[PDB]
Amino acid sequence: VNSFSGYLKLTDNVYIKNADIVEEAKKVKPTVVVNAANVYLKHGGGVAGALNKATNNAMQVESDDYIATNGPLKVGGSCVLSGHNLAKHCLHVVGPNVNKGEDIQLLKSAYENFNQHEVLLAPLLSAGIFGADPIHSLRVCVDTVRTNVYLAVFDKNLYDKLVSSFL
Ligand SMILES: Cc1c(C)n(Cc2ccco2)c2ncnc(N)c12
Numbered sequence: 001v002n003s004f005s006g007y008l009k010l011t012d013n014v015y016i017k018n019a020d021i022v023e024e025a026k027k028v029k030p031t032v033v034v035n036a037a038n039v040y041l042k043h044g045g046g047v048a049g050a051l052n053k054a055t056n057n058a059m060q061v062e063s064d065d066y067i068a069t070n071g072p073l074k075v076g077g078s079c080v081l082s083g084h085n086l087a088k089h090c091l092h093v094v095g096p097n098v099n100k101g102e103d104i105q106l107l108k109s110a111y112e113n114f115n116q117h118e119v120l121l122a123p124l125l126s127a128g129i130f131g132a133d134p135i136h137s138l139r140v141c142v143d144t145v146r147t148n149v150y151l152a153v154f155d156k157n158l159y160d161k162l163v164s165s166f167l
Pocket of ligand 1: 152153
């Protein structure tokens, strides 16, 4: 038993809810919250800017130190950093950005990062400002992630479409 409430069960391990990933993290304080990161960990808008804003920019300060030491992530890659006031840990995962020409095949590699963590609160990778088809992102999630993932979908309209079209 865990602290996640109000989720619709899609599979043995995948759950979904119409929720802002920021308000959900503040309420639950999960072990792992996933950020929809870019390779530079520049948390300008979308999930990364809302998560970063909720940390009062501490996520960006930590991220800049990480990049100054390690250089950029890979598209499809991740790093674990602090969750600040939102979670124990933040898993920064880089899904491909369709609006930059990145190979959508890298979405599966992105979701494979989630398997290193028993339980996660996450957004749909490449949804929102990343520009991918969210229906596709949910299918890759279900077919790739084997650990327990709690998906927060910001848009109520999209949430209802994801549920009603789910095979
Ligand atoms: C700010 C934000 C974005 C852009 N997204 C991704 C998305 C999916 C559909 C509409 O936007 C989010 N997803 C979960 N929580 C959030 N706060 C967000």
